[PDB]
Design a protein around this nucleic acid. Structure first.
Ligand SMILES: NC[C@@H]1O[C@H](O[C@H]2[C@@H](O)[C@H](O[C@@H]3[C@@H](O)[C@H](N)C[C@H](N)[C@H]3O[C@H]3O[C@H](CO)[C@@H](O)[C@H](O)[C@H]3N)O[C@@H]2CO)[C@H](N)[C@@H](O)[C@@H]1O
Ligand SMILES: [Mg+2]
Ligand SMILES: [Mg+2]
Ligand SMILES: [Mg+2]
Ligand SMILES: [Mg+2]
Ligand SMILES: [Mg+2]
Ligand SMILES: [Mg+2]
Ligand SMILES: [Mg+2]
Ligand SMILES: [Mg+2]
Ligand SMILES: [Mg+2]
Ligand SMILES: [Mg+2]
Ligand SMILES: [Mg+2]
Ligand SMILES: [Mg+2]
Ligand SMILES: [Mg+2]
Ligand SMILES: [Mg+2]
Ligand SMILES: [Mg+2]
Ligand SMILES: [Mg+2]
Ligand SMILES: [Mg+2]
Ligand SMILES: [Mg+2]
Ligand SMILES: [Mg+2]
Ligand SMILES: [Mg+2]
Ligand SMILES: [Mg+2]
Ligand SMILES: [Mg+2]
Ligand SMILES: [Mg+2]
Ligand SMILES: [Mg+2]
Ligand SMILES: [Mg+2]
Ligand SMILES: [Mg+2]
Ligand SMILES: [Mg+2]
Ligand SMILES: [Mg+2]
Ligand SMILES: [Mg+2]
Ligand SMILES: [Mg+2]
Ligand SMILES: [Mg+2]
Ligand SMILES: [Mg+2]
Ligand SMILES: [Mg+2]
Ligand SMILES: [Mg+2]
Ligand SMILES: [Mg+2]
Ligand SMILES: [Mg+2]
Ligand SMILES: [Mg+2]
Ligand SMILES: [Mg+2]
Ligand SMILES: [Mg+2]
Ligand SMILES: [Mg+2]
Ligand SMILES: [Mg+2]
Ligand SMILES: [Mg+2]
Ligand SMILES: [Mg+2]
Ligand SMILES: [Mg+2]
Ligand SMILES: [Mg+2]
Ligand SMILES: [Mg+2]
Ligand SMILES: [Mg+2]
Ligand SMILES: [Mg+2]
Ligand SMILES: [Mg+2]
Ligand SMILES: [Mg+2]
Ligand SMILES: [Mg+2]
Ligand SMILES: [Mg+2]
Ligand SMILES: [Mg+2]
Ligand SMILES: [Mg+2]
Ligand SMILES: [Mg+2]
Ligand SMILES: [Mg+2]
Ligand SMILES: [Mg+2]
Ligand SMILES: [Mg+2]
Ligand SMILES: [Mg+2]
Ligand SMILES: [Mg+2]
Ligand SMILES: [Mg+2]
Ligand SMILES: [Mg+2]
Ligand SMILES: [Mg+2]
Ligand SMILES: [Mg+2]
Ligand SMILES: [Mg+2]
Ligand SMILES: [Mg+2]
Ligand SMILES: [Mg+2]
Ligand SMILES: [Mg+2]
Ligand SMILES: [Mg+2]
Ligand SMILES: [Mg+2]
Ligand SMILES: [Mg+2]
Ligand SMILES: [Mg+2]
Ligand SMILES: [Mg+2]
Ligand SMILES: [Mg+2]
Ligand SMILES: [Mg+2]
Ligand SMILES: [Mg+2]
Ligand SMILES: [Mg+2]
Ligand SMILES: [Mg+2]
Ligand SMILES: [Mg+2]
Ligand SMILES: [Mg+2]
Ligand SMILES: [Mg+2]
Ligand SMILES: [Mg+2]
Ligand SMILES: [Mg+2]
Ligand SMILES: [Mg+2]
Ligand SMILES: [Mg+2]
Ligand SMILES: [Mg+2]
Ligand SMILES: [Mg+2]
Ligand SMILES: [Mg+2]
Ligand SMILES: [Mg+2]
Lengths: 138, 124
RNA sequence: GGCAGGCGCCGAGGGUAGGGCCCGUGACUGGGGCGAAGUCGUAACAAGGUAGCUGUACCGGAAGGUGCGGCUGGAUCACUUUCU
RNA sequence: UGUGGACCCGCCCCUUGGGGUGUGUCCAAAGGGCUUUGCCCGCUUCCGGAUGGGCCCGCGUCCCAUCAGCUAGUUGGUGGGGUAAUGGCCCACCAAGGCGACGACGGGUAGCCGGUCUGAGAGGAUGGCCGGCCACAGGGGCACUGAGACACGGGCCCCACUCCUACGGGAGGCAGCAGUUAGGAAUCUUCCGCAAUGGGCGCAAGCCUGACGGAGCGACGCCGCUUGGAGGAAGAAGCCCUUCGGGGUGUAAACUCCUGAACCCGGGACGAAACCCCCGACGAGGGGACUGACGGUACCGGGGUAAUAGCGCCGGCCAACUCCGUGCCAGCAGCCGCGGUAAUACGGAGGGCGCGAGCGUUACCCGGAUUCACUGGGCGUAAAGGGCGUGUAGGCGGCCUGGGGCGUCCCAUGUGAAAGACCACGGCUCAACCGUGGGGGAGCGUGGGAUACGCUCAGGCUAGACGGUGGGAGAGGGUGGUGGAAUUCCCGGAGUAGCGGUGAAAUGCGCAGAUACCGGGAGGAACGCCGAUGGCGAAGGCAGCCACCUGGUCCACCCGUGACGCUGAGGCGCGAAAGCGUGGGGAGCAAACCGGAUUAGAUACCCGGGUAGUCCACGCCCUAAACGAUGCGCGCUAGGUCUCUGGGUCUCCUGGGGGCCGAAGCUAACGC
């Protein structure tokens, strides 16, 4: 049993990107889904999809990297350089609309669950809500 | 440690050990010389260092050092002390203030006079 | 009916019997830490000249030795000669 | 007298003792003064307000667990007492409760706060002026008076201390202002005034006020200010260097001119206009009079003198180098370090650096120190993984739906006094200081709203976990039994001069016949080969063979249950060796010990003996280099290869386990 499934996904992703996979399966959940939707909108992932690895439902996430580079070590630049869980179980982290993080001076997002749904830092600022700071990505 | 651990125990604030129990907190303490002695220094230093076992108003018998060219202290000299490691003499942790009570200002000094407590020499 | 007065409970503190706690002093005695050039050896570092460390147990001026078991944090295809 | 109010009973609304109501009872009062029938000051009762308070509650408030149990008015109930009022506040009777690992009980320390210092912040430290609350008045109790006290300059009593005393008996209480003394490194005048502001009484005149407004002392702090300004040599003298040519102090000085702190002279404040009195009405309004401690101070004007500079530092950190002196001395030193005859580190000098009416020292707090890490650290070898398990509380918890809305989020609102902090304008010539305004603020209360996540309740699911069926490998554990090799001992045979041991030897054993060899017996302990590069176990640890009794595990099927999970303080159990107890056993081996050697010595290493012990049962002990020096669980992230053990279509696939090399990556490196 996975202790935190949001973090297992943020990670699965991070591990995949770091070896430049094409895509990767994370087991399905509306919430995980709700998050990836945002990753797509902001362009951190090409897309997601509801594949079905042997009977049980997964989310094929498709990754997006940079172009090839010149020099020793061509490996392209990650589009997701950094993706970290802010609120973890046994240390939940809620912020009010007044103290929602400015991530990398905004060259990056923070994803927070609110009573108005899963939103980005700029999305919650407009709507005027806080919630549970789930992760920053930049 | 886990957050929950830091919840159950906590962190632990630190504690300062005074390098000078001149009690009362006080910046100086008065005492009476009971021994004017001489002490051999250590490690890579040889000489003959001036020292005074001093019985303090704080009810403490501590050995204090006697800075300066030369002194005038005797086994009943009332003296005022002030804290300061003498690096060489281990276990000597305070200095005797020079120019207060029985201990006299270093004679014929021109340079660093406030330490050593010797008045401005006159001139006209 | 009041007052004075009287008795009683409670009651500060005191006494006696026994306890627990903290501070001072202390004849004796235990080891510690410091301090250029005092004494004995030479245990450890090189296979430190008996590989070392180790828990335990006895023994020894002293480091230490030996028993039992453990560890590698042991040198190399073949010996015993303290110190500075 | 009853406006009204209190109380008992009843009814009404309300909802705790709130408000109404009807009988019955009960409860009022004070007089004074006048420019005397008409007002002023008082009095009585009731309702309301304002201010000030009591009590109760939620949450917050340091260290020690080397304090783990605590409680008998204790915990609750009924009735009473008490109070302004609730209440074990107190009392009687009854019940047997109450509190604690979310730290009771105990011990230590401490007034709390607004604030203060520091810090990028989060934090850390502090509670000194000022303001708020609390508590105290020589130490301990206690009530009385009263709206209020358990009462600093009221009372009573006991205690300790001082002073009077005619011996019986009395008098005191500066933690009020000054002041003395003691202690200490250290902390002020026995000052002026009630002019202002404030308080008590008074109708007022006024009285009282060590509150207070001022002054005094101390560089204790902050701010402001002076010790001059402009000219002035290729550049005095003295002092110091030097390559003997010079270079430095140095425009510094002298000197020229200019301004004019100090000092003198004259003017001289603001703070003060009310109370009072007159007109009007004793109201609104207008008129008048009095009053200044600070103080002849501040400020203004005239006159006018070139008029205090110290202190620390100069090896690096760290701004500033040269001579002499000293010789591991004398000494310096925050840390590193300087000094042993050429010292930029000691002492002086010249020179230089930094601050400057101050400059240093010591002490303490925060900082740097992500050096207790929430922000923001670590544990293979640097300090750090518990010896291993089982499991309690606790923490944490897969996928789908619905309810609630506890956490969380949002809006509105109340609160967050003043001072301080921020910003602006303003007052003292500036600032320090001060005035007015503005702004911000964590937290908590109330009304409303959201539901993604977390919580909760109600269903559902099968991917986690567990079970069924069928197979498998294993030194996993316990009890019994049994096998051979060897050592020692005993009995017999044969046999004779040594054996044994070491570098070499010697103790030692052997003519009571050893050693070597054959045959028989006893016993105790260990299990060669197989066997390791292997297996099993949670760890310790497990190895001849057989049987019995037991534990874990792995594969296939995809059958059952339906989140039943993970970890785990404490608890419980296990736990090499040595060690301990009782009993047994005792071959070999062997601490101590007894000898022989070796050595300078030899309490050692080498040799010959040898007890405990090593063995078995039962009961303790609880340690370790208990090691992978690497907690357990789950997910993710190239591959190659060797090996143990399952399964399937078996050149190859697919599990579980044990090694090696290596992708990414990590690491202080080693390495992983
Ligand atoms: N501080 C030393 C500690 O005490 C012991 O060491 C202590 C003694 O054993 C040692 O003695 C030594 C001696 O071994 C050596 N051979 C001679 C030397 N003079 C001595 O030294 C001692 O004494 C002299 C005066 O006599 C002092 O000047 C010196 O400072 C001091 N260390 O001096 C030490 C005390 O200063 C422990 N063995 C040692 O492990 C431990 O570190
Ligand atoms: Mg000096
Ligand atoms: Mg009476
Ligand atoms: Mg040696
Ligand atoms: Mg070695
Ligand atoms: Mg002994
Ligand atoms: Mg030892
Ligand atoms: Mg021995
Ligand atoms: Mg050994
Ligand atoms: Mg080590
Ligand atoms: Mg009536
Ligand atoms: Mg009622
Ligand atoms: Mg009524
Ligand atoms: Mg009535
Ligand atoms: Mg009457
Ligand atoms: Mg009258
Ligand atoms: Mg009120
Ligand atoms: Mg009772
Ligand atoms: Mg009662
Ligand atoms: Mg009980
Ligand atoms: Mg106190
Ligand atoms: Mg910090
Ligand atoms: Mg105060
Ligand atoms: Mg007193
Ligand atoms: Mg008094
Ligand atoms: Mg008096
Ligand atoms: Mg004194
Ligand atoms: Mg007055
Ligand atoms: Mg007044
Ligand atoms: Mg000039
Ligand atoms: Mg002039
Ligand atoms: Mg003038
Ligand atoms: Mg007046
Ligand atoms: Mg009139
Ligand atoms: Mg008027
Ligand atoms: Mg001049
Ligand atoms: Mg420099
Ligand atoms: Mg000398
Ligand atoms: Mg210092
Ligand atoms: Mg010299
Ligand atoms: Mg030299
Ligand atoms: Mg010098
Ligand atoms: Mg220096
Ligand atoms: Mg810190
Ligand atoms: Mg660290
Ligand atoms: Mg270590
Ligand atoms: Mg371990
Ligand atoms: Mg350990
Ligand atoms: Mg549990
Ligand atoms: Mg969940
Ligand atoms: Mg739960
Ligand atoms: Mg819901
Ligand atoms: Mg809520
Ligand atoms: Mg305020
Ligand atoms: Mg501040
Ligand atoms: Mg101004
Ligand atoms: Mg609110
Ligand atoms: Mg609300
Ligand atoms: Mg809803
Ligand atoms: Mg369910
Ligand atoms: Mg089976
Ligand atoms: Mg077995
Ligand atoms: Mg025979
Ligand atoms: Mg013989
Ligand atoms: Mg014979
Ligand atoms: Mg034999
Ligand atoms: Mg035989
Ligand atoms: Mg026998
Ligand atoms: Mg294993
Ligand atoms: Mg082992
Ligand atoms: Mg089995
Ligand atoms: Mg099934
Ligand atoms: Mg079902
Ligand atoms: Mg467990
Ligand atoms: Mg054991
Ligand atoms: Mg044993
Ligand atoms: Mg035994
Ligand atoms: Mg025995
Ligand atoms: Mg026996
Ligand atoms: Mg032997
Ligand atoms: Mg033997
Ligand atoms: Mg046993
Ligand atoms: Mg243990
Ligand atoms: Mg893992
Ligand atoms: Mg096969
Ligand atoms: Mg494998
Ligand atoms: Mg293994
Ligand atoms: Mg690499
Ligand atoms: Mg690391
Ligand atoms: Mg590397």
């Amino acid at each position: 049993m996975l202790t935190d499934p949001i973090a297992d996904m943020l990670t699965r992703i991070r591990n995949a990107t770091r070896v430049y996979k094409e895509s990767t399966d994370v087991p399905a959940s509306r919430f995980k889904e709700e998050i990836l939707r945002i990753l797509a909108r902001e362009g951190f992932i090409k897309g997601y999809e509801r594949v079905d690895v042997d009977g049980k439902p997964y989310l094929r996430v498709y990754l997006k990297y940079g172009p090839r580079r010149q020099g020793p070590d061509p490996r392209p630049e990650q589009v997701i350089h950094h993706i970290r869980r802010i609120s973890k179980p046994g240390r939940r982290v809620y912020v009010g609309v007044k103290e929602i993080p400015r991530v990398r001076r905004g060259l990056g997002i923070a994803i927070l669950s609110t009573s108005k749904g899963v939103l980005t830092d700029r999305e919650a600022r407009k709507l005027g809500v806080g919630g549970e700071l789930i992760c920053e990505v930049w | 440690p886990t957050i929950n651990q830091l919840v159950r125990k906590g962190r632990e604030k630190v504690r300062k050990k005074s390098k000078v129990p001149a009690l009362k907190g006080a910046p100086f303490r008065r005492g009476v010389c009971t021994v004017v002695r001489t002490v051999t220094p250590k490690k890579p230093n040889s000489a003959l260092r001036k020292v005074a076992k001093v019985r303090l108003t704080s009810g403490y018998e501590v050995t204090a050092y006697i800075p300066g060219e030369g002194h005038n202290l005797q086994e009943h000299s009332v003296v005022l002390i002030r804290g300061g490691r003498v690096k060489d003499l281990p276990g000597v942790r305070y200095h005797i203030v020079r120019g207060v009570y029985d201990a006299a200002g270093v004679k014929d000094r021109k340079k660093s006079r406030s330490k050593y407590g010797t008045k401005k020499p006159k001139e006209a």
